[PDB]
Design a protein around this ligand. Structure first.
Ligand SMILES: NC(=O)c1ccc[n+]([C@@H]2O[C@H](COP(=O)([O-])OP(=O)(O)OC[C@H]3O[C@@H](n4cnc5c(N)ncnc54)[C@H](O)[C@@H]3O)[C@@H](O)[C@H]2O)c1
Ligand SMILES: NC(=O)c1ccc[n+]([C@@H]2O[C@H](COP(=O)([O-])OP(=O)(O)OC[C@H]3O[C@@H](n4cnc5c(N)ncnc54)[C@H](O)[C@@H]3O)[C@@H](O)[C@H]2O)c1
Ligand SMILES: O=c1ccn([C@@H]2O[C@H](COP(=O)(O)OP(=O)(O)O)[C@@H](O)[C@H]2O)c(=O)[nH]1
Ligand SMILES: O=c1ccn([C@@H]2O[C@H](COP(=O)(O)OP(=O)(O)O)[C@@H](O)[C@H]2O)c(=O)[nH]1
Ligand SMILES: [Cl-]
Ligand SMILES: [Cl-]
Ligand SMILES: [Mg+2]
Ligand SMILES: [Mg+2]
Ligand SMILES: [Mg+2]
Lengths: 310, 311
């Protein structure tokens, strides 16, 4: 059965892909984001502004709301913290107030940054059973996402609202624009393509997830929505690589050596190891990513080369 | 006996007014900062949400110590006024952290014992370190703002070497706390009892209440033994724990009426059941030695409210 779905942050990277995927499945989808655009089934709403949020829900009825509207990224959160807190937290509270009033089901976008610098396997239950000091969030961005999770749980507890939280991991792929405030993959690709120098912080491990894969699993939440649940959504546990390995994949795909690269040991204040357990998404959400990092990076290099015309 | 130059944000508030007065009485030079204009000397209006206004405070004076109390106080207040809550408690605190990172004053950050959530065991400070995270999930936005603030203080300390002591005040009450329906239980009980107006007692809860003059003495002692990176519960004594009816009965006894005006309920939903505080750390570092137990403190507060509202 097809649903009426709101996607806030629907003009962003995951949001755009998710909107298209949901529409591809036959759902009716309103995309909402912070700017005006040309596109149909689109509405500008600053989620910081209660009146604008209420306006969304006055115009349309929704079965499901994917809430992605956010100031994304740890460095962004430090440099633009006012926008960060107002959007990520007050916006989420406005959305929860709407949810309490209207009873839609919500998919809340948190972040695997909620796990802080935890160096064990990032299973969802780390944010339940582990000593609280394991996951002290390392930047404001990460704290907003954890605050959002707490607010979702308090709302469910107080009003019986129905919410699934997701913790996206290190999503990358075609249609993600470059900026210096994006994740490492688009930074590496854009710099490599332009033969421009960039830094690799060696002492870190990540699992990158291809947008098409992650979006398929996000879209699957509608088909198996379990109120109160939380899911890591990302690649595969065994797709862990260190940062040099990812850089080398980018350089290989561009076809250049690492002469443009400055290597540093570690990025301060940055999660060392971010190795995720996806068994829960595998169980409930038919999580089955098809695009491993080598292949994904190639596709992303190809998209960036074409899109920025290198 | 060393004079400090001290800023107190939230300095026209309940704890803030008492703290400013106590610090001044000790010989410190204290600027009070708050959200409204007042008649007071050594006072400046600054909305801590507004970076420019925060920056103005630090253009005017250099401070050795900053007590950061400016906040939207209270769990119900946080739910009904959440925009102000998040902007002030969190963005305001981040502006203060940015100033601290630039200027290097020492800060006392005011958190809340609500950060312990509904934990049923002894609320030692390290419950926020060693206990499973689910033991202390914060139960309302206000509690989340305080926990977010503590995390931000720790991150600033890690990243910039800023020097901050966090305090978790508990259930502070006393003279100079005005009534509103958004205050804690003690001034609600007192004001309603004084007016012979009905009020509700949620029975299935225990609290340790702390008399403002005692708590401010300990908060003031921090500038005398400031250990960067520390966190302290500051409240009464573990032995002064009572259930809510017991506190209600103290209020009624002090007003001189019976409990005919009281509506009893078994428990308040989404409210911490038991808040058994461990004050060993404050006793150890801060000469914490509260002198006013609840019975006496309630009497003093009843008397103060009686005169101030001319009942
Ligand atoms: N990309 C990842 O790897 C990753 C990792 C962890 C968490 N997340 C979270 O997933 C979501 C999507 O990530 P993304 O990579 O697509 O980020 P993105 O920045 O591309 O998407 C976020 C969108 O939200 C919009 N937005 C910001 N403030 C808004 C406001 N006040 N009102 C309305 N819209 C507003 C932005 O304009 C943007 O289009 C975000 O919530 C992000 O924090 C992503
Ligand atoms: N039992 C307690 O009283 C208790 C318990 C736990 C935590 N706390 C915390 O201790 C502090 C003092 O509590 P209180 O009982 O005196 O509360 P209060 O409300 O009397 O004091 C807070 C003060 O902050 C001011 N303020 C609010 N927003 C501001 C802004 N944007 N800019 C500047 N000033 C602003 C208010 O005007 C007020 O005077 C608060 O941070 C509170 O959250 C108190
Ligand atoms: O220019 C850059 C940006 C990031 N990184 C590293 O890439 C990893 C992922 O960083 P990002 O901010 O993309 O994601 P997160 O840290 O949230 O997983 C971290 O180890 C960073 O140190 C890097 O080496 N160079
Ligand atoms: O009108 C009221 C307000 C509060 N309380 C109780 O008093 C205690 C203290 O609540 P408050 O909000 O003052 O503080 P906190 O919950 O943060 O300790 C709780 O058990 C409440 O249920 C009560 O019985 N009646
Ligand atoms: Cl993230
Ligand atoms: Cl409090
Ligand atoms: Mg438009
Ligand atoms: Mg003035
Ligand atoms: Mg504003």
């Amino acid at each position: 059965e097809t649903q009426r779905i709101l996607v806030t942050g629907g003009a962003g990277f995951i949001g755009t892909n998710l909107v298209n995927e949901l529409r591809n499945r036959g759902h009716e989808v309103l995309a909402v984001d912070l700017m005006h655009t040309e596109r149909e089934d689109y509405m500008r709403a600053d989620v910081r502004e209660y009146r604008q949020v209420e306006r969304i829900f006055e115009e349309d009825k929704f079965d499901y709301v994917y809430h992605l509207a956010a100031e994304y990224g740890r460095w962004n959160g430090e440099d633009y913290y006012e926008n960060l807190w107002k959007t990520n937290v007050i916006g989420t509270k406005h959305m929860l107030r709407m949810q309490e009033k209207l009873g839609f089901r919500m998919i809340f976008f948190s972040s695997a940054e909620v796990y802080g610098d935890y160096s064990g396997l990032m299973s969802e239950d780390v944010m339940v059973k582990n000593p609280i000091s394991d996951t002290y969030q390392m930047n404001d961005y990460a704290i907003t996402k954890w605050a959002g999770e707490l607010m979702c749980m308090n709302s469910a507890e107080m009003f019986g609202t129905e919410t699934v939280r997701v913790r996206p991991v290190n999503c990358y792929g075609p249609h993600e624009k470059y900026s210096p405030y994006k994740g490492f993959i688009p930074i590496f690709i854009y710099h490599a393509l332009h033969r421009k120098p960039y830094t690799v912080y060696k002492g870190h491990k990540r699992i990158i997830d291809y947008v098409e894969d992650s979006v398929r699993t996000f879209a699957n939440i509608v088909d198996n929505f379990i109120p109160g649940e939380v899911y890591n959504v990302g690649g595969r546990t065994e797709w862990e690589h260190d940062i040099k390995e990812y850089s080398d994949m980018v350089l290989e795909a561009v076809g250049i050596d690492d002469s443009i690269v400055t290597y540093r040991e570690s990025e301060p204040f940055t999660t060392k190891v971010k190795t995720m357990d996806f068994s829960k998404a595998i169980r409930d959400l038919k999580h089955d990513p098809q695009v491993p990092p080598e292949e994904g990076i190639r596709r992303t290099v190809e998209w960036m080369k074409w899109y920025y015309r290198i």
